[PDB]
Amino acid sequence: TSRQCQEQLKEVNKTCEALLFKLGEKVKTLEMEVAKEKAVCSKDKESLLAGKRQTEEQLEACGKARERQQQEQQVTEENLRKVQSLCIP
Amino acid sequence: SRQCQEQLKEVNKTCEALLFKLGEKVKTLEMEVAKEKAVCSKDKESLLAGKRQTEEQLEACGKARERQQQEQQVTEENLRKVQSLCIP
């Protein structure tokens, strides 16, 4: 075993070994990111759906109010025509 | 530098083979992150657009029930005015 063979054996895996540690850190970082994105997505979707449900309920109520205001108008209009036709016999 | 080079070769080959196996894990996870972010943002955009259209419908319905009330006031005012000219 030469002294230059020994120096080479000491150095051969250094960058490979240092990369192994860095890849462990990257795996952990990516596993946390997957878990976080999945949790934030579902939370955001729930808020959007809740906001949308509230607007749909308001649209339903407005629509029903619109049907009963067009109902009353038809009655008032006929009463007005009746009074105008029978006015001054 | 005789059997030393064959030693340097086998030790690095073992280390490099482990690095590439672990590297398959990183690549798999990067693709999963990219896929989920694309599906999530696309779905969020559709939900927000759908919400924006229902609000516009609620705004239009509200403006239509404002026109109906104003026209009901017009009919009631005409009825009140014509009643003063006609016997009940």
UniProtKB/Swiss-Prot annotation, chain B:
Subcellular localization: Cell membrane; Membrane, Caveola; Cytoplasm, Perinuclear region
Residues annotated as glycosylated: N12
Tissue: Expressed in lung, kidney, spleen, heart, muscle, eye, pancreas, thyroid, thymus, submaxillary gland, prostate, epididymis, uterus and liver.
Outcome of gene disruption: Mutant animals result in lethality during prenatal development. Examination of the homozygous deficient embryos reveal subcutaneous edema, hemorrhages and defects in the vascular wall of subcutaneous capillaries. Hearts of deficient embryos show ventricular septal defects (VSDs) and thinner ventricular walls, as well as blood abnormalities.
Coiled-coil regions listed in the entry: 3-22, 51-86
Protein task: Endothelial cell-specific membrane protein involved in the formation of the diaphragms that bridge endothelial fenestrae. It is also required for the formation of stomata of caveolae and transendothelial channels. Functions in microvascular permeability, endothelial fenestrae contributing to the passage of water and solutes and regulating transcellular versus paracellular flow in different organs. Plays a specific role in embryonic development.
Subunit structure comment from the entry: Homodimer.
Stated name of the protein: Plasmalemma vesicle-associated protein
Species of provenance: Mus musculus (Mouse)
Full-length numbering of the shown residues: 141 to 226 of 438
